[PDB]
Coordinates of C-alpha atoms in Angstrom, one line a residue:
Chain A
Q1 CA 114.6 92.0 96.9
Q2 CA 114.5 96.2 97.2
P3 CA 114.4 96.7 94.0
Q4 CA 114.6 100.3 92.3
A5 CA 111.4 100.8 94.0
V6 CA 107.8 99.4 93.8
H7 CA 107.0 99.0 98.0
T8 CA 105.4 102.1 97.5
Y9 CA 102.6 102.9 100.5
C10 CA 99.1 103.4 101.1
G11 CA 97.2 105.6 103.1
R12 CA 98.3 109.3 104.7
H13 CA 101.9 108.5 103.8
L14 CA 100.4 109.0 100.2
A15 CA 98.6 112.5 101.4
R16 CA 102.6 113.7 103.1
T17 CA 103.7 112.7 99.1
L18 CA 102.3 115.0 96.9
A19 CA 102.5 117.7 99.5
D20 CA 106.3 116.6 99.5
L21 CA 106.3 116.7 95.7
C22 CA 103.7 119.6 95.0
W23 CA 106.6 121.4 97.3
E24 CA 110.1 119.7 95.0
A25 CA 107.6 121.1 91.6
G26 CA 107.8 124.6 92.9
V27 CA 107.4 125.8 96.5
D28 CA 106.0 128.5 94.5
Chain B
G1 CA 92.4 107.3 95.3
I2 CA 96.4 107.6 94.6
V3 CA 96.7 104.6 97.6
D4 CA 95.3 102.3 95.1
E5 CA 97.2 103.9 92.7
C6 CA 101.2 103.5 94.6
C7 CA 100.1 100.3 96.8
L8 CA 98.3 98.0 94.4
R9 CA 101.3 99.3 91.3
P10 CA 104.0 101.5 90.5
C11 CA 103.9 105.0 90.3
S12 CA 107.1 105.8 90.7
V13 CA 107.7 109.4 90.1
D14 CA 107.4 110.0 86.8
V15 CA 103.3 109.1 87.5
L16 CA 102.7 111.0 91.1
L17 CA 104.4 114.5 89.6
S18 CA 100.3 113.6 87.8
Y19 CA 98.6 113.8 90.4
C20 CA 99.6 117.1 91.1

């Protein structure tokens, strides 16, 4: 059904998420 | 626990952006 977004992840893939967001939120 | 938040229910950027 590949909607807009829901698949999400679980474990690890989340420790990488806040590593890419805190990164896009301002790599500074 | 951010896993039981995105795995279980939505958390699209407008929700993870808040985890940082």
